[PDB]
Amino acid sequence: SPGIWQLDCTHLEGKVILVAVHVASGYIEAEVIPAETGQETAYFLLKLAGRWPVKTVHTDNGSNFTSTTVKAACEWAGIKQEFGIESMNKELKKIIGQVRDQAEHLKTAVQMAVFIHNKKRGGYSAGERIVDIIATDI
Amino acid sequence: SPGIWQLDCTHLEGKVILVAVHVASGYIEAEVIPAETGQETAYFLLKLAGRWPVKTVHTDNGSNFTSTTVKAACEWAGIKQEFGIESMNKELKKIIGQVRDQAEHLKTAVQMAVFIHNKKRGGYSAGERIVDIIATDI
Numbered sequence: 001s002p003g004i005w006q007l008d009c010t011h012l013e014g015k016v017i018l019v020a021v022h023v024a025s026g027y028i029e030a031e032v033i034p035a036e037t038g039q040e041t042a043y044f045l046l047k048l049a050g051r052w053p054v055k056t057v058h059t060d061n062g063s064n065f066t067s068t069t070v071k072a073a074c075e076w077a078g079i080k081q082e083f084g085i086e087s088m089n090k091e092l093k094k095i096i097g098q099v100r101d102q103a104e105h106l107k108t109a110v111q112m113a114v115f116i117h118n119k120k121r122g123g124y125s126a127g128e129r130i131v132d133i134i135a136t137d138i
Numbered sequence: 139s140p141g142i143w144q145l146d147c148t149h150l151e152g153k154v155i156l157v158a159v160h161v162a163s164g165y166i167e168a169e170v171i172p173a174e175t176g177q178e179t180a181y182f183l184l185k186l187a188g189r190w191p192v193k194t195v196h197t198d199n200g201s202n203f204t205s206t207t208v209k210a211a212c213e214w215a216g217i218k219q220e221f222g223i224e225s226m227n228k229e230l231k232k233i234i235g236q237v238r239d240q241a242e243h244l245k246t247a248v249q250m251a252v253f254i255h256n257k258k259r260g261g262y263s264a265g266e267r268i269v270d271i272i273a274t275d276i
């Protein structure tokens with residue numbers, strides 16, 4: 001469970017936002033991409049696996065089983081793709097809405113929204129939780 | 139020291155690679171950017187601060203004191219910019235060289251190289267070190 005992620009897509013302003021959630025913490029990473037092409041997901045997954053333990057990525061549809069570059073990225077980095085395992089996507093759009101005028105590019109708003117999600121709660125934030133799970137594991 | 143980073147630039151194939159090193163671990167993040175414009179560094183810094191504790195960013199030159207968007211990003215996220223505090227850039231180009239044919243875009247090679255740097259050593263890797271410092275700190 002230190003290494004289990006979910007990968008989803010949400011849409012704002014005709015752009016695609018790639019969302020990775022660390023299922024045990026609620027920690028999120030996101031990127032705005034022009035078009036959802038296989039090569040985009042592959043770059044995002046390779047960046048995520050260089051940064052954290054990424055052992056299993058669950059997706060809720062078939063799109064990610066049809067990309068040879070996602071498959072090649074996953075092989076290289078030692079990532080198992082799994083089919084099946086959220087309301088994360090709703091929280092994110094709430095925060096993105098509050099900040100949308102505060103900056104020009106959708107992608108800056110997306111990252112401010114990831115920052116608030118990860119750093120907010122007095123218990124632990126999702127950001128402390130992921131470090132605590134992986135530390136506690138090491 | 140959990141929150142202290144260095145930010146540098148290196149160059150390959152007429153593109154700029156933005157490198158953040160967590161000084162106490164040797165953990166690195168990198169991005170290929172078209173052109174070094176203020177807005178690029180600002181997006182990278184906001185992504186890094188959503189992911190980790192980023193309290194102080196040291197740079198070795200003046201470029202980052204002249205961008206209103208780096209300044210605005212740093213204010214919003216609570217980042218102190220500092221002037222002054224590597225051979226990281228040499229290790230990275232060694233690994234990038236070994237993988238360069240293994241993939242099309244320079245940026246994929248850059249990320250495979252970050253992955254190897256972060257996961258390699260039997261002591262601790264830079265990736266376990268950063269999680270151990272922040273966990274040990276929390």
Ligand SMILES: O=C(O)Cc1c(C#Cc2cccs2)oc2ccc(-c3cccc(F)c3)cc12
Nearest residue numbers: 039040042043046069072073076241242243246
């Ligand atoms: O560079 C490529 O060849 C295609 C590619 C992208 C991308 C992108 C972009 C997004 C937006 C504009 S370009 O990310 C990757 C990650 C892994 C592999 C790969 C492939 C084989 C073995 C391996 F080890 C890795 C290939 C990619």
Ligand SMILES: O=C(O)Cc1c(C#Cc2cccs2)oc2ccc(-c3cccc(F)c3)cc12
Nearest residue numbers: 103104105108177178180181184207210211214
């Ligand atoms: O969206 C913008 O307005 C400009 C911007 C970029 C970028 C980029 C790109 C890179 C490559 C193509 S576009 O990253 C940022 C991070 C923070 C702030 C900012 C500004 C004021 C307050 C605050 F809280 C944040 C502005 C940006």
